[PDB]
């Protein structure tokens, strides 16, 4: 929803963007550009809404009024990573985004990376790869049927296997330096965006979410000056997309909650 | 008086129309894309020999001369944005390499069959046609329009159309009532 | 072609006597500089490209070779202190190097720098 | 030798005689089949033999043991549908002739 | 045993649908004068007359050719000899070209037989897609080449 | 002229087939043998001379 | 079709080692070597001797080339009873057990294969045919195996390799024999797939003049195949 | 020496992943162990993909057995989870297949892809 | 052998000629392997093709491991 109107962004699963006026219960435009499915969708006070389009890897802002679309690739490649460094993992697709300003957003990939960028720049400002950490290696008792248990762990092949967690949630608070991210790692992690708006840093850690985080929401209440925030966030057993995600050892269903206070 | 409107012709008859492989040609290419007429085979060729005379010229000039440099890149920034040549064979000798099928294979009626929107090349044209073929946000009725790469994934059936989610067409609605009555 | 090799020879001689002249070879950044010129001394696809048309290194290398040893002959000689065996310690694997080069003039200025040594 | 295949017996029975009458003339068994043009004579060395199916193929490639019979003539004679066809198409000739 | 050759799979009726560019083109010996006799260069005359890259090629009893003629054609001998020029071996005894060059368009219809002689033309144009190059007036022409 | 081009191609398919073999698709179902026979002593076979 | 229970009429070849089975729809076949046991579950034909029961096996031309030259009519076959053999290429015992076949007992099959997993079965088949004798390396190194292969008298090669040219001539020039059989199978795709067919055929032909084997033919597999050729030549080991 | 290999690199495997989604919506993809079995025996497959964290991994040593004997390029992906998101399915997936088809509209990616795998085997 | 018993198992090894042609045949196949002795024999047809997937499932591991195990049979 368009913060403070009736206009609601709609994307849906044929490589469109629809529009639509609550209060009139009507149609207002289609609206065309992304490759793939359009799987995530933010919108602001403005009309300017975002998008990721999941495996064709591009986050697009709209100007409605306009009639013109931005577009944004991450552009980043595990060979010149390391290289600069004498596990990165590819950017495999794009499934969440939040507008933390109606000038920056923040995208979620499911190599684990959360990425800000920034209208000026179609190239990412900042990254943080493999934000929640890598998934457990699978069992050696489990990968082979072979009694030898050294010819099992070759089949691990070190640590190749290894694939890292995916952001299945990222929501930011409107016009803060806030924003929560989640996943199946078992903890919501808050970030901290600078003042400055060119880097965030890990704020803290919640660890009472298990399961997966398929939504965040954060709700607010008291005095301008002490405020207390309260987030909540759906947790499920299985991805909302599909059920590809094996089974996660604790996991519930159920809507988590958080309370935090402000002092200083 | 108002000043000429220029114009030119698309297209230029063969040298020797009447040469046996020359037929057989035409009638294998026609069979493959659903085209109407020999006319469309003849504007392609044109259109092919412009192009493959044009980089003939400038691969005959020296390397580095800016006109070779400015030209010759902008004639390979345009194929292959038509999607004809490849991003790997960025050179004017796979521009010479070029054929017809190629441009071809551009066109809407024969990317229509491929996504598997028509069953044949002639239901492609059927099709296009009619006007249920939209490119994004626009219905092109144009069997000749050529797609680019980006375009090439907004191919789909038009929001008017009776396949694309609009009502039945006027045979389906008419039985639909004399069934009712 | 051997003439031009000539007229560089006596550009190279030129910029030597320059050098010789010049500050900079009373400071001990003219011997890391010899050290560095030293260092830095030692069928589908054709079928489809187009043709329309019917080694220096070496000589590279032993130019750059033949100029670091006159340069460092020429230091030397001039400013007494440089003429010591810890300044001098390093340059003693590039000597032997070029007392082996198929140059004969190069060789010739290694000899000449081994007199000063000797 | 290893490679040579049994002679046919002279006043060999009539069956094998035959059935190499239906080889000869294996065009003209079904209508809606056509075979290359071929003169065929009977081969001086050769002999009768019987299909080995895979046990995989029980479904798709195999005749029931009632269906198998010790000649391929009789077999023809199994079929229903050849014998209609074969039935009328002797019935038109006559008539014409 | 008696043979009836395979209509080879590269031809649809008298169409060859295998010749594509770049070109594959057999030189013979009368070619290389006309060639010089009009001033016209082998590799660019081709890639002009075709708008493609030409490859040419020499076959053994085509370069035999040659070195019998004497030295009133060394000219010819030594274009011959460009390296851009590939060489093809022979692997019957006669070092006659006009057998060499038909058997080998016979076999396989990848090649443009370059010649200006009467005879060997007409024996060409009597098989089916083989396109036929010649030296005419000023520049190369190809007869049976729908790609043009 | 488009549906006559159309009944023209498809027609002279079916000849190139008589002209030569066309690959239809290779192998469908169990291998039942050759429908049309096997001929001994003939040779399809293009002889370097 | 030919179902389980039909009977079919076996006689010669005109290649020796070879039978065609004739009926509504004839099949090519070869005698078997291990009667009683198919090796990639072909159709099998029992004929009963003066009894003992000899069996035959059907070969398919779509799963084996070199039945498919058959097929097409290949007019000489070097292939031939009593006949040493190496079989380059040999993937498995689809093939190479047919060729056993032909050569005989008296005959020889030398099956060189490089990966190990198709390897194993061509062991396993190797040891019910005592005919056969695999070697499990790379054919790019003849050294490596040049003592367990000596003269052998027919070399097919149906390695699907872009420079399969090199493999066939540095084989042919140490075991081959004079005035030598050489069998090869060229699909274009595999060596060049920016070139037409024939053109890689062309190239190919002319790579085995260079390697002193004179080509004696080329055929076309299709309708088995597409994009594929059988070139059999003869090796002149003083000069073509 | 593992027996899953070879395994292809992160690079490699995002490029085979977008091609198997294309498939997918062009009805060019053949989904699961056993069908990809099937289209060996039929010789139309183009290329197989197989997860390397198959549970457990001898369940798709068959295929590359099937392929070096029909000299079908195959290649290993690290992740099944992820191979099942790309063929469009909502299962993970632990084997997929390129059926061959010379009409298709993604001819010049399949063999892109196809190149890279053949050079790394 | 855990899976199906031990005689059976047997006789499927015998019907497809190797333990590795057991492992290379599709899952459909297998079933029609042993559809002459009823060997894993409307609700009574799907436990025989699902339980014929299973025994598929059993011969890859048993024949591409060097020394297999018994724990994927039990669970299996
Ligand atoms: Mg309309
Ligand atoms: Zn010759």
Same mark, same amino acid.
């Given at each position: ?7 609601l962004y709609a994307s849906c699963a044929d490589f469109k963007i629809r529009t639509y006026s609550i209060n ?158 989640? #996943? ?72 988590? #909650? ?7 | ?124 044209? =059927? ?19 050529? =797609? ?34 | ?118 | ?97 | ?38 001033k016209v260069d082998i590799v660019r005359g081709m890639m002009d007359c075709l708008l493609a890259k030409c ?94 | ?49 | ?34 009667? $009683? ?66 050569? $005989? ?74 005035? $030598? ?60 | ?70 000299? +079908?390029?195959? +290649? ?46 | ?76």
């Amino acid at each position: 929803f368009r913060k403070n109107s009736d206009q609601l962004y709609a994307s849906c699963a044929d490589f469109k963007i629809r529009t639509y006026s609550i209060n009139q219960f009507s149609q207002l435009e289609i609206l065309y550009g992304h490759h793939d499915i359009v799987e995530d969708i933010s919108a602001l006070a403005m009309e300017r809404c975002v998008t990721v389009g999941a495996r064709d890897r591009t986050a697009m802002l709209w100007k409605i009024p306009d009639e013109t679309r931005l577009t944004f690739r991450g552009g980043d490649e595990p060979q010149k990573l390391l290289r600069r460094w004498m596990l990165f993992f590819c950017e495999g697709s794009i499934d969440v985004v939040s507008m933390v300003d109606d000038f920056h957003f923040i995208t979620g990939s499911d190599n684990g990376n959360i990425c800000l960028w920034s209208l000026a720049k179609k190239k990412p400002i900042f990254t943080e790869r493999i934000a929640h950490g890598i998934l457990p290696e699978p069992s050696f008792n489990d990968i082979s049927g072979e009694t030898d248990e050294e010819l099992r762990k070759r089949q691990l092949q070190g640590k190749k296997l290894l694939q890292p967690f995916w952001i299945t949630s990222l929501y930011a608070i409107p016009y803060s330096n806030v924003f929560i991210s989640g #996943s199946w790692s078992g903890s919501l992690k808050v970030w901290k965006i600078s003042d400055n708006l060119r880097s965030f840093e890990l704020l803290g850690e919640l660890s009472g979410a298990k399961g997966v985080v398929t939504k965040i929401q954060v709700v607010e209440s008291g005095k301008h000056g002490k405020e207390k925030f309260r987030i909540l966030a759906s947790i499920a057993k299985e991805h909302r997309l599909g059920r590809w995600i094996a089974n996660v050892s604790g996991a519930r269903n159920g809507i988590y #909650s958080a309370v935090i206070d402000q002092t200083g | 008086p108002r000043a000429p409107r220029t114009y030119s012709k698309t297209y230029s008859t063969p040298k020797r129309p009447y040469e046996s492989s020359r037929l057989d040609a035409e009638l294998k290419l026609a069979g493959e894309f659903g085209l109407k007429n020999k006319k469309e085979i003849y504007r392609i060729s044109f259109q092919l020999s412009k192009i493959r005379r044009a980089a003939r010229d400038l691969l005959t000039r020296d390397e580095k001369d800016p006109k070779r440099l400015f030209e010759g890149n902008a004639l390979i920034r345009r194929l292959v944005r038509v999607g004809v040549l490849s991003e790997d064979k960025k050179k004017l000798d796979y521009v010479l390499a070029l054929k017809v099928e190629d441009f071809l294979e551009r066109r809407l009626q024969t990317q229509v069959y491929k996504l598997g929107l028509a069953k044949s090349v002639h239901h492609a044209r =059927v099709l296009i046609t009619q006007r249920h073929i939209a490119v994004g946000k626009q219905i092109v009725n144009i069997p000749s329009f050529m =797609v680019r790469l980006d375009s090439e994934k907004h191919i789909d059936f038009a929001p008017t159309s009776p396949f694309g989610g609009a009502r039945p067409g006027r045979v389906a609605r008419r039985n639909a009532a004399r069934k009712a009555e | 072609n051997l003439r031009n090799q000539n007229k560089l020879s006596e550009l190279l001689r030129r910029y030597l006597l320059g050098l010789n002249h010049n500050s900079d070879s009373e400071s001990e950044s003219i011997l890391k500089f010899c050290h560095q010129l030293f260092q830095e001394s030692e069928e589908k696809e054709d079928f489809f490209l187009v043709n329309l048309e019917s080694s220096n290194s070496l000589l590279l290398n032993s130019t750059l070779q033949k100029f670091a040893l006159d340069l460092l002959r020429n230091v030397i000689t001039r400013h007494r202190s440089f003429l010591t065996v810890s300044h001098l310690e390093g340059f003693i694997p590039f000597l032997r190097d070029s007392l082996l080069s198929e140059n004969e003039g190069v060789v010739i200025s290694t000899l000449r720098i081994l007199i000063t040594l000797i | 030798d290893w490679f040579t295949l049994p002679k046919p017996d002279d006043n060999m029975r009539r069956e094998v005689q035959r059935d190499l009458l239906l080889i000869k003339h294996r065009a003209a068994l079904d209508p809606k089949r056509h075979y290359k043009k071929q003169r065929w004579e009977v081969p001086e060395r050769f002999a009768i033999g019987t299909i080995i199916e895979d046990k995989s193929e029980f479904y798709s490639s195999r005749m029931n043991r009632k269906e198998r019979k010790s000649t391929i003539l009789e077999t023809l004679m199994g079929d229903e549908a050849s014998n209609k066809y074969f039935k009328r198409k002797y019935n038109e000739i006559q008539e014409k002739s | 045993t008696r043979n009836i050759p395979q209509v080879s799979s590269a031809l649809f009726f008298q169409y060859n649908q295998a010749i594509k560019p770049p070109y594959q083109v057999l030189i013979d010996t009368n070619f290389i004068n006309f060639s010089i006799q009009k001033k016209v260069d082998i590799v660019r005359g081709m890639m002009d007359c075709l708008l493609a890259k030409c490859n040419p090629l020499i076959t053994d009893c085509v370069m035999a050719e040659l070195e019998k003629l004497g030295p009133k054609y060394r000219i010819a001998l030594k274009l011959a000899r460009d390296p851009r020029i590939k060489r093809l071996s022979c692997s019957h005894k006669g070092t006659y070209a006009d057998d060499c060059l038909v058997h080998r368009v016979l076999q396989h219809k990848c090649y443009i037989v370059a010649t200006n002689d009467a005879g060997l033309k007409q024996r060409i144009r009597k098989i089916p897609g083989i396109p036929l190059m010649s030296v005419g007036g000023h520049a190369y022409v190809i007869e049976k080449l729908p790609d043009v | 002229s488009r549906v006559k081009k159309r009944k023209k191609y498809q027609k002279a398919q079916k000849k190139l087939k008589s002209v030569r073999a066309v690959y239809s698709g290779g192998q469908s179902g169990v291998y039942e043998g050759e429908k049309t026979g096997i001929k001994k002593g003939l040779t399809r076979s293009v002889k370097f001379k | 079709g030919a179902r389980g229970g039909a009977k079919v009429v076996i006689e010669p070849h005109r290649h020796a080692g070879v039978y065609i089975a004739r009926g509504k729809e004839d099949l090519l076949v070869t005698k078997n070597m291990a009667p $009683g046991e198919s090796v990639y579950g072909e159709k099998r034909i029992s004929v009963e001797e003066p009894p003992t029961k000899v069996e035959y096996r059907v070969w398919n031309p779509f799963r084996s080339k070199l039945a498919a030259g058959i097929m097409g009519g290949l007019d000489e076959l070097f292939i031939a009873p009593g006949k040493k053999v190496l079989y380059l290429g040999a993937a498995s015992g689809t093939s190479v057990s047919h060729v056993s076949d032909v050569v $005989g007992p008296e005959g020889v099959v030398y099956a060189v294969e490089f990966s190990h997993r198709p390897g194993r079965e061509l062991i396993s088949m190797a040891k019910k045919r005592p005919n056969i004798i695999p070697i499990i390396e790379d054919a790019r190194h003849p050294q490596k195996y040049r003592m367990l292969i000596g003269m052998v008298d027919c070399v097919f090669a149906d390695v699907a390799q872009p420079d399969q040219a090199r493999i066939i001539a540095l084989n042919s020039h140490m075991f081959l024999k004079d005035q $030598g059989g050489v069998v090869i199978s060229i699909k274009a795709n595999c060596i060049d797939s920016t070139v037409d067919a024939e053109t890689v055929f062309a190239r190919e032909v002319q790579k085995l003049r260079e390697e002193r084997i004179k080509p004696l033919e080329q055929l076309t597999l299709e309708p088995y195949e597409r994009d594929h050729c059988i070139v059999v030549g003869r090796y002149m080991r003083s000069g073509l | 020496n593992p027996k899953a290999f070879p395994l292809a690199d992160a690079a490699l495997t995002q490029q085979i992943l977008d091609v198997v989604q294309q498939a997918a919506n062009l009805r060019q993809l053949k989904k699961g162990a056993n069908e990809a079995t099937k289209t060996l025996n039929r010789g139309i497959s183009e290329f197989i993909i197989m997860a390397a964290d198959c549970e457990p991994i001898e369940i798709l040593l068959h295929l590359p057995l099937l392929c070096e004997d029909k000299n +079908v390029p195959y +290649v290993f992906v690290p992740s099944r989870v992820a191979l099942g998101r790309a063929c469009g399915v909502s299962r993970p997936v632990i084997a997929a297949s390129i059926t061959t088809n010379d009409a298709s509209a993604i001819k010049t990616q399949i063999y892109a892809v196809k190149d890279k795998i053949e050079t790394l085997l | 052998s855990e899976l199906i018993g031990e005689v059976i198992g047997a006789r499927l090894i015998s019907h497809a000629g190797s333990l590795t042609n057991l492992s290379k045949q599709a899952a459909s196949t297998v079933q029609i392997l042993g559809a002459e002795k009823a060997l894993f024999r409307k609700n009574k047809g799907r436990i025989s093709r699902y339980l014929a997937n299973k025994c598929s499932m059993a011969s890859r591991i048993d024949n591409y491991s060097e020394e297999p195990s018994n724990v994927f049979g039990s669970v299996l």
